[PDB]
Design a protein around this nucleic acid. Structure first.
Ligand SMILES: [Zn+2]
Lengths: 81, 144, 155, 150, 129, 87
RNA sequence: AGGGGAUCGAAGAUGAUCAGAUACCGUCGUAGUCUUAACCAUAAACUAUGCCGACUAGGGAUCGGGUGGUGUUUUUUUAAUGACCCACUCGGCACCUUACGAGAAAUCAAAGUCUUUGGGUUCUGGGGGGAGUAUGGUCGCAAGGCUGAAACUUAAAGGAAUUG
RNA sequence: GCGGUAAUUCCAGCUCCAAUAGCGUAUAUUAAAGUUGUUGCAGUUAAAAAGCUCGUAGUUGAACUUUGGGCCCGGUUGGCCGGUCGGAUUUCCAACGGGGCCUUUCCUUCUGGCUAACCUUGAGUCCUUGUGGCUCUUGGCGAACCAGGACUUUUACUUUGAAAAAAUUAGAGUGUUCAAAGCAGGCGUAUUGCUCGAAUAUAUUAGCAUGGAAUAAUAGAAUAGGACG
RNA sequence: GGAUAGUGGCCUACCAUGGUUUCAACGGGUAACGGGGAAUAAGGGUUCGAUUCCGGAGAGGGAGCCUGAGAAACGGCUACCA
């Protein structure tokens, strides 16, 4: 304060603020491949559903949406990127 | 920006809004509406001359306590009637009723002068000669 | 404006003196007269191809384009062979140092050599008085119909 | 801003600097564009379709993998609707609201909200009509509004 | 809504100067702002600024020294008829010997002085001292 | 502030804060001057030798003089780590 | 214009009181108060503070949404749910402390960034009284609403603070 | 605000002050007046935010599209010298602009009328070891604007200029003895003329003419009813 | 078409239904002839201009017209009102 680095802000507190208030804005939403042992085939899913996503060929379930991120369907697993 | 449209094209709004606001300037409202010609006992003229109707003695406003000698005058130009003070000491002596005095303002534009209520005018030239030359001793009152 | 009939008045509609002889066998029927107003205003194809008469037509009539040459937006097309255009402008007021929006509606004669509608920015040239309020004549339709076909429907 | 309320909230979508990529993305434009038009035949709005393709499918944004925006795809394959999406849903709401009022005229608030919704409608359509996509005559009236949806 | 960005940026630089800071996060950015700042550093009331590129309208980071009292914008970009530049500088400039009025001419966004030499004129942007 | 044929005129070329470059004038009794001893090898601190700083009244009141010391008197050499220009 | 009419209660009638007491106080109680259908369009309708935008300072709360935790508490077998804790961030109704700054002051996160005077835009005001009066116009069933002068008079009116 | 018996304001004496062939007064006007506020007012409590929201006219309205580099040409100050009989110009040399360049880069476009301009050169040289210099016709620059055909997105803004009665005004010269004025006048050979003037400027909006191409509008190819050939 | 010295709803005949307007039409006011100009000096303004220069209008009011190159003249005529 009175002097700092606007061009180079510490990642420690660049990740506390808002998605639009950062140095150059961007999303806090990740994509993840999601798998259920019912099938041998995984499914790409967005972390904030809105739409209750269904699986591959097994019409079972994957996620039911919420106020933000999607709750996952218990007996499943997931991996980012 | 406190209201006033600052745009490069709002000239009309600004001059109009001017006129509008200008009407709350007393001397301007007066100068346009007429007043000086409508109202006002003179013609808007600097002076006006009339006939003395009766010699008056006005009790003066507070906290002053005396009697201020004036005359009621009926202007020759327009027949309006106006009570006007006679300045200096005496000088209500020089007048008499039924004469021909020349009246002027009291340097206030309307507005009664001192403690003289409702008197906005004064004597400046009675019977033809100046009231001053009469109160000193220069000139003397014409014929009758 | 005009359209159809051409000969549609109590008096015969003929261009002055432009005589053609019935003895003289013809394929053109009536011999036609035209010119060019000058000032690089290309005398339009429809003026020479035309069949109308208009003696107030700058290209095929007996008037002359001279003086001021102006342009404006078309606000009115109702009166026959004459329209009303609105030239806008800004007036500089020094006291407030600002320009204020103003306009003027010039009445201008339009030859049946044009196809003017309301909106077509247009270029007119001063002439003689031809009427009570007419001192100009349309001499170039700069616009078109303002992308009017662009607003259509489906398929 | 926010017009018909002085509610100054901020709640959008922060777009990545990555106008290209996802880099972790295989497939092609082929697949996902077929997805778009097919879902369009299924009868979904560009917003709906975008959300769907963004969740169940692997499309962060369907403007980058395919150099064209969804509604433009729909227009391209001849799937565009009578009026744009936003004007449609505005009008639709206005119609349901109106019905609510004609079910009880004692609700002043409802009349307020109807005035507002309709003002919004008229402004919008004035824009659309400025840009040739709403026919130069097109206007909203209730007595053709309740028909306009169907 | 944001009426004139140049105004905002200049107010940001100014509040920066006053508050005691040396760095100014200004947003958004545009060619006009750039040229302004460019004729600002050319006479050295600021250090150097860095255009950071969000893929939208932009950002700028102005490192200033503190030689600047106050810079401003004449928002109604009035037209200046070569005789009127004298009047404007006379208006908002602390003295003849320094401080410069900056304006937009058909010869570019230049200070009153360069404008005087080049013998060009136009609308007015603001001022620096 | 010189005159005609060169030559200095106008007395008094005032101080200046090291932190803000804001001019320091007479009635600002809130300003300050900080003398740092220029010490020598192992222990001793040479008198008649100071790293002298100046911090104007504004900053002193704002309470940035501390941070302006960690700023100035460290990249002037006489402190290590402590303050990072990135925040 | 119907309904309804408990309650309390302009009017009015009364018992008191005071010199007087058409009041204050008590008793009676019309209208009103509730309501549906239509009017009316004014309140100190007040934060006595136009709206949109940017910037300028630290703090503990709390409302609403979200995020982050091998945090507490609930046990069914470890969870899952649910409340609580801490952190962080949006948008709130608020306070606290300070003053860079502002004001005539009281005070003010604006009432700040404003003679170093220009982001955008709407509105109103120009000494006091006359007077929200007169006149015209429009609205209303009415009461009244909007629009709204002048003649004349006047050296003050008024604001905030201090000591008495 | 003074006067109701010691009146620094009244009636006078005396003295004194300001202005001076003039001074008072009444009315109006301008300044004062940032009390009309574009510059530049004010509106919590002193005058003054419409009870509230919509919303047409009006005012206003995010950012982005030829940015950057290299080469020449000649005009004006200003700097050490002077090459001189107060002022002259080369170049040593920075400063400050303007003209044309080539960088994927219409300038309306054909059809020749003009070519001044050079990648040209034809013998070389007056002459500093020569790219310092230009007289000099034959393969060889389009714009330098012509005359004629053929077509052109519209603006605001600014620039220079033309067109612009005199009196007025700002202002140069001239000693009406001075001044306000006037445009006179000044010189010998004053017995047979000599001669300088009677300037310049403002002349702001609109029309014309032109240089600019930022700022700010505008129009364009999406049912391609597009672009060139 | 007629009329003019000639353009023109200038007038007539037919025909059409158009023309200005909150970017303020139309109407009212003016103790309003317009301009060159003038008064007031930071600037921006404000106020003024019947009046020696230019342009217009009238010759108590109105209309009409003779003469003539030119007048709807008035130190011209004609009629009406005062
Ligand atoms: Zn599955």
């Amino acid at each position: 304060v009175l002097v700092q680095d606007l061009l180079h802000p510490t990642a420690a507190s660049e990740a506390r603020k808002h998605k639009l208030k950062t140095l150059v804005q961007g999303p806090r939403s990740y994509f993840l491949d999601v798998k259920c042992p019912g099938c041998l085939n995984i499914t790409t899913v967005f972390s904030h559903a809105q739409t209750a996503v269904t699986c591959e060929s097994c019409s079972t379930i994957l996620c039911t949406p919420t106020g933000g991120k999607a709750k996952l369907s218990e007996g499943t697993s997931f991996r980012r990127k | 920006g406190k209201g006033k449209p600052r745009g490069l094209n709002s000239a009309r709004k600004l001059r109009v809004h001017r006129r509008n606001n200008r009407w709350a300037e007393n001397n301007y409202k007066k100068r346009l509406l007429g007043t000086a010609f409508k109202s006002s006992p003179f013609g808007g003229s600097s002076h006006a001359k009339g006939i003395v109707l009766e010699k008056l003695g006005i009790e003066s406003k507070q906290p002053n306590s005396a009697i201020r000698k004036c005359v009621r005058v009926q202007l020759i130009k327009n027949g309006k009637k106006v009570t006007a003070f006679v300045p200096n000491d005496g000088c209500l002596n020089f007048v008499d009723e039924n004469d021909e005095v020349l009246l002027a303002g009291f340097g206030r534009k309307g507005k009664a002068k001192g403690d003289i209520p409702g008197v906005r005018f004064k004597v400046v030239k009675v019977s033809g000669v100046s009231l001053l030359a009469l109160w000193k001793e220069k000139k003397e009152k014409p014929r009758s | 404006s005009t359209e159809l009939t051409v000969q549609s008045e109590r008096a015969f509609q003929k261009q002055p003196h432009i005589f053609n002889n019935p003895k003289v066998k013809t394929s053109k029927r009536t011999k036609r007269w035209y010119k060019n107003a000058g000032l690089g205003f290309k005398t339009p194809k429809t003026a020479i191809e035309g069949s109308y008469i208009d003696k107030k037509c700058p290209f095929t009539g007996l008037v002359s384009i001279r003086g001021k040459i102006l342009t404006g937006t078309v606000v009115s097309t109702k009166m026959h062979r004459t329209i009303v255009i609105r030239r806008a402008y800004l007036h500089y007021i020094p006291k407030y140092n600002r320009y204020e929006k103003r306009h003027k509606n010039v009445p201008v004669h339009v030859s049946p050599a044009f196809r003017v509608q309301v909106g077509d920015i247009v270029t007119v040239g001063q002439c003689r008085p031809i009427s009570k309020t007419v001192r100009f004549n349309v001499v170039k339709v700069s616009a078109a119909x303002x992308x009017x076909x662009x607003x259509x429907x489906x398929x | 801003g926010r017009m018909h309320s002085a509610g100054k909230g901020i709640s959008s979508s922060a777009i990545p600097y990555s106008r290209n990529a996802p880099a972790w993305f295989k497939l092609s434009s082929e697949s996902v564009i077929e997805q778009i038009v097919k879902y369009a035949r299924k009868g979904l709005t560009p917003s709906q379709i975008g959300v769907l393709l963004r969740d169940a499918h692997g499309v962060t944004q369907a403007r980058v993998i395919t150099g064209n925006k969804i509604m433009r795809i729909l227009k391209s394959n001849g799937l565009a609707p009578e009026i744009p999406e936003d004007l449609y849903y505005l009008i639709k709401k206005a119609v349901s609201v109106r019905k609510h009022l004609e079910r009880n005229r004692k609700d002043k608030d409802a009349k307020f909200r109807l005035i507002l919704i309709e003002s919004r409608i008229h402004r919008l359509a004035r824009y659309y009509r400025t840009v040739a996509v709403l026919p130069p005559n097109w206007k909203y009236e209730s007595a053709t509004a309740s028909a306009l949806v169907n | 809504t944001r009426s004139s960005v140049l105004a905002d940026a200049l107010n940001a630089i100014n509040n920066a100067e006053k508050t005691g800071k040396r760095q100014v996060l200004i947003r958004p950015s545009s060619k006009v702002i750039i040229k302004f700042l460019q004729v600002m550093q050319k006479h050295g009331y600021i250090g150097e600024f860095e255009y950071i590129d969000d893929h939208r309208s932009g950002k700028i980071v102005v490192q200033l020294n503190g030689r600047l009292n106050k810079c401003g914008v004449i928002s109604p970009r009035f037209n200046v008829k070569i005789g009127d530049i004298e009047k404007w500088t006379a208006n908002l400039l602390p003295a003849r010997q320094f401080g410069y009025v900056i304006l937009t001419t058909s010869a570019g966004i230049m200070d009153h002085e360069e404008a005087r030499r080049k013998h060009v004129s136009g609308k007015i942007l603001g001022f620096v001292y | 502030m010189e005159n005609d044929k060169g030559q200095l005129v106008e007395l008094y070329v005032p101080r200046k804060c090291s932190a803000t470059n804001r001019i320091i004038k007479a009635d600002d009794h809130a300003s300050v001057q900080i003398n740092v001893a220029k010490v020598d090898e192992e222990g001793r601190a040479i008198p008649g030798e100071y790293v002298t700083y100046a911090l104007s009244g504004y900053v002193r009141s704002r309470g940035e003089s501390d941070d302006s010391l960690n700023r100035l008197a460290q990249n002037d050499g006489l402190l290590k780590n402590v303050w990072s220009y990135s925040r």
